[PDB]
Design a binder for this molecule. Sequence first.
Ligand SMILES: [Mg+2]
Ligand SMILES: [Mg+2]
Ligand SMILES: [Mg+2]
Ligand SMILES: [Mg+2]
Ligand SMILES: [Mg+2]
Ligand SMILES: [Mg+2]
Ligand SMILES: [Mg+2]
Lengths: 187, 147, 134, 174
Amino acid sequence: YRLKAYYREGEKPSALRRAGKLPGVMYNRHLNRKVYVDLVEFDKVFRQASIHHVIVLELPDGQSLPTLVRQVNLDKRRRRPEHVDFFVLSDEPVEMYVPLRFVGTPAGVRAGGVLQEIHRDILVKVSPRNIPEFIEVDVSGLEIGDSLHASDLKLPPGVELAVSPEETIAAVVPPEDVEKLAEEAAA
Amino acid sequence: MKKVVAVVKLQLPAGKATPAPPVGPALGQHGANIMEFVKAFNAATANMGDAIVPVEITIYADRSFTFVTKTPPASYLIRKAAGLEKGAHKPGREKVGRITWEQVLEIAKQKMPDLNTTDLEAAARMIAGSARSMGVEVVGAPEVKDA
Amino acid sequence: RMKYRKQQRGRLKGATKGGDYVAFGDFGLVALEPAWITAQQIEAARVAMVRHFRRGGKIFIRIFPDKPYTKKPLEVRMGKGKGNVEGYVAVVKPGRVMFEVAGVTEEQAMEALRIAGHKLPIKTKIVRRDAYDE
Amino acid sequence: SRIGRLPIPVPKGVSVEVAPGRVKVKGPKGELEVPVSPEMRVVVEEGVVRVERPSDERRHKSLHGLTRTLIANAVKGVSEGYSKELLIKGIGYRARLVGRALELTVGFSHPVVVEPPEGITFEVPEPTRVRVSGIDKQKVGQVAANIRAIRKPSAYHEKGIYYAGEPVRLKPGK
RNA sequence: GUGGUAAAGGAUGUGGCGCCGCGAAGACAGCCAGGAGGUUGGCUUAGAAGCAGCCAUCCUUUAAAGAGUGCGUAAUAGCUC
Ligand SMILES: [Mg+2]
Ligand SMILES: [Mg+2]
Ligand SMILES: [Mg+2]
Ligand SMILES: [Mg+2]
Ligand SMILES: [Mg+2]
Ligand SMILES: [Mg+2]
Ligand SMILES: [Mg+2]
């Protein structure tokens, strides 16, 4: 995705937030720069972008920049963006989460059960060229008690993982109900 | 060139029945004549084997009834090859049986002239389809195919 | 629980740590006013949710009572009150993520957390997932 | 979606005169003054009357539509005339005309007597029917309502004074 | 008559901002025709036949009708979206 971005300076952060202009910082191991973008555009973008799908920032210089959101500070009391750190990529391998799509319903949910998708993404080290939009997961043999670790995984072509292999990607959990309260009323 | 007053839906075996409820209150206070009415009703069930045929009744203005024999219930066709007299209490986690779609095909040929559904390629999934709410799945071979 | 004995009151300042983000589940319930949620109210809202949909998904409770409520037997002024008449309470500052839900559709979760909102001494606020992770 | 901007048809031949805050509608059956809010614009065009609102704020819309409808009902009133019909459903129940006045036997200890107001005509066709006629719409409606109120329809029997075509919903008992 | 001094919570109050869906290939509204077939869904149940509850994922006549929104009845048909 692409998005308009402007250069920042000694202007009041608070006043800029008043103007709806969300503050930000574009940087890598070489660059470090104060910037600011528009909030309304940042919303419609981030709803579909997030840290996963890469974004390209625009500048008055005409420079397009292969950025990536590393973190976004949030203000308390009704969730809302405060500030945004942009990681301008390069070409060398660099860590970032990648989404997941648990295709096919498990055995547990069918016979009454709930999918407790632990990880909605997986942190893997990868080159700026390899950007898998989603990694399929053949979850189906799972019952309301079994689980899927990072061990068994649709590991992408030429893409290693950074997180520990024993890390639990997902699991299935029992459906609680009113009949549970019967025992809960006793003990 | 025919009269009507109150359509009514009663289920009873093709050859054996009695004025007992719910067939009773259906034609007890409405007044029925089991002298010539059943003497034409038993005829349409004489050669036909046993079932739970839902003869779609439609009580005339002259206290008669339309004994047009419609095809047996959807529940009746699936539990045929299984030997069951019922089905799964909760069709989701449970499954009393699992007949193939091969039994589904040829038994659906006795559930089509009364149906307005055209071909059997559409009539089979009507049988195997209601079965998924009954407590029984299927396994076939041709299906989608494509190219 | 274990700890040791009763505990002071202490004023709840600004919603500093009283503010998070949906970790588990789809939708979520969030606060807007500072409050001491009793150990009764939590179970009241939980049982309200499980009462709404039966054999539903799974309910989370990202808050927990551990602050000893005190109380005197309606008398004068001898020492601190033994209390626990309300038992324990949970300090919740505006925006703190409280109750999560999953495995249920929009209307189920919406209506459920809506019911949970009235079983509470706070003005509540239901929230989706948005996209803002970590 | 806008009743007020829909022009009012004018039958031949009823004279319509605009006035500050009022409008006179003269016609073959009588005359009718209609109160108009001073804010509005009443326009007497060829064979048609129109209404224009000062602005598109809430009050002015709500006055626009009401104005148009009132004047329109005046126009229909002076020419075609309004008349509602009332049914009497009951065993000992009956109606009969005496002078201009109407007499009812609604099962009370005394026969009811209702007098016609100015610009109102009672009519008794069948003994169990009463046609109220007149030029004023709201006056006729009010008169019919008042005659009806003498004995409202029962909640358990077909017993009372009904509007013409009024659906008779009834509750069981024992 | 707010102002002239109370909260949870509620409402087609009024004005302002924005996002989403439908619309000149003719919509929403009111108005004329159908609203259905095996079906009376499986199962529980004295009765459960679109209509106490438990459980869920068929097709076809067709320009159109959700194995079904509520009311009605012992169960029906109905009213209609
Ligand atoms: Mg970590
Ligand atoms: Mg414990
Ligand atoms: Mg203090
Ligand atoms: Mg004292
Ligand atoms: Mg409340
Ligand atoms: Mg007398
Ligand atoms: Mg309020």
